[PDB]
């Protein structure tokens, strides 16, 4: 569900984008654990203040370039289960219906 290297599905507007977790944030220690890991917030690494104090995660979007890595907290990063897949498919179908309404 939520672990280093594990898959995750995060909201982005009226649709979700699946990503893989790379860093796990610990707000209590002001620290993130990464994998090739006790280490402070990076010199170029930072998290938005609304998720600096929450359980944030560094994720990479699959099908997207490595430059689209994002720090997403528990607010949008959902638990990857059957409900998550069904709900991703549901909002994909709703996006398809919105596109068809824009067309026909």
């Amino acid at each position: 569900e939520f672990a280093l290297g594990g898959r995750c599905l995060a909201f982005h507007g009226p649709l979700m984008y699946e990503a893989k977790i790379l860093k796990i944030w610990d707000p209590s220690s002001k620290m993130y654990t990464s994998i090739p890991k006790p280490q402070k917030l990076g010199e170029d690494e930072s998290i938005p203040e609304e998720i600096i104090n929450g359980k944030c995660f560094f994720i990479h979007y699959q099908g997207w370039k490595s430059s689209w890595d994002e720090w997403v907290g528990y607010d949008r990063i959902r638990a990857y289960n059957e409900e998550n897949i069904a709900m991703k498919k549901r909002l994909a179908n709703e996006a398809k219906e919105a596109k068809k309404s824009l067309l026909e």
Partner: protein
């Protein structure tokens, strides 16, 4: 007699349930340690200990009296 555990279903259709007696509640092996036919009991682990204890007690008194 044959006993089997239920199969894995999608958690969309999974109907988890928790009892209230917490001491005596006859359940199948579909328990959870912490179409309305595949309800998995949330067993309240201490209830496992209790249920084991008086079960051993009954197994004693069947041959003791």
């Amino acid at each position: 007699k044959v006993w089997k555990k239920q199969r894995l279903i999608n958690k969309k259709n999974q109907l988890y349930y928790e009892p209230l007696q917490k001491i005596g509640y006859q359940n199948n092996g579909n328990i959870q340690i912490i179409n309305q036919d595949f309800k998995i009991t949330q067993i309240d682990e201490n209830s496992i200990k209790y249920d084991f204890f008086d079960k051993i007690y009954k197994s004693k008194m069947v041959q003791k009296r």
